[PDB]
Design a binder for this molecule. Structure first.
Ligand code: E1J
Ligand code: H81
Lengths: 145, 140
């Protein structure tokens, strides 16, 4: 098995996890009854898929509408992530309060997760991959990469 | 009298003195603002102070702020005289207007105050406020 073939089977494993929505290997951090972060409950190797930043994938026109509606209510939060993909502006809108864990992962300048665009049939997905080997029990912390 | 009253609100905005309020501290973190004196309905409370910029410089800053989630989301956009402005309160400062929490049933509301054609976003009392109340804003 070549490196190219190993990368193909990895992408297929990520496709299956994205479309199944299963988010194993992680759990919510609780202080004072509030979901404040996410802890790894299993090892992750450098480059392994961790979780998707899940949300509605939309373009700028729909996004600017939602943003004006969201501004009227601070209870929403700022969860709209903008990015370029193949000379095209996209937005992942995770405003919606859900059980998904990707939007609960805290930022750190020296985190253990970084962002990456994962293509499925030409549709970009923002995923978090391990920027280094992660031990079980670590808080997951993301930076932009 | 009208000219005089409008001049006093201007002086408050320009002097930057923010009397009648104080920080609410939990765990050493500034989390809210408490009134230390009464306010009557319609009284000036505080400015949401920041850089007043237009749509071009605003997007340039917002993308730069996005790469650093430790900044927070402090850019407030609004229309004034058929022109889009933004008040950028991102810089962490001692100003208290950016510390006031939002509540659908708050005691403060937003209002645009003109100073020589330049809009300022201020908070006014939407009802009589007793001393000791937490200041909570909504959009008016
Ligand atoms: C994600 C973007 C977003 O939420 N934008 C909302 C508008 C900009 N941010 C804030 N705007 C205000 N005001 C607008 C005019 C009147 C007051 N106030 C706050 C206060 C904030 O902290 C309050 C204490 N937690 C924050 O925190 C980021 C933002 C704004
Ligand atoms: C203002 C505006 C603004 O700040 N825009 C930033 C991008 C959109 N917002 C967010 N993006 C992301 N990511 C984007 C891809 C990688 C992860 N993660 C977030 C996690 C959050 O809470 C974690 C628990 N404290 C959160 O709380 C509101 C917002 C997040």
């Amino acid at each position: 098995k070549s490196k190219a073939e190993l990368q193909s089977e990895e992408r297929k494993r990520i496709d299956e996890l994205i479309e199944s929505g299963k988010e194993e290997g992680m759990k919510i951090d609780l202080i004072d009854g509030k979901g404040r972060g996410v802890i790894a409950t299993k090892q992750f190797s450098r480059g392994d898929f961790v979780v998707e930043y899940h949300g509605d994938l939309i373009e700028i026109t729909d996004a600017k509408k939602r943003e004006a509606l969201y501004a009227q209510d601070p209870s929403t939060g700022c969860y709209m992530y903008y990015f370029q993909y193949l000379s095209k502006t996209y937005c992942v809108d995770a405003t919606r309060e859900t059980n998904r864990l990707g939007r609960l992962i805290n930022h750190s300048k020296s985190g253990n997760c970084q962002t990456k665009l994962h293509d499925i049939d030409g549709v970009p997905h923002l995923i978090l991959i391990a920027s280094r080997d992660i031990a079980a029990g670590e808080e997951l912390l993301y930076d932009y990469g």
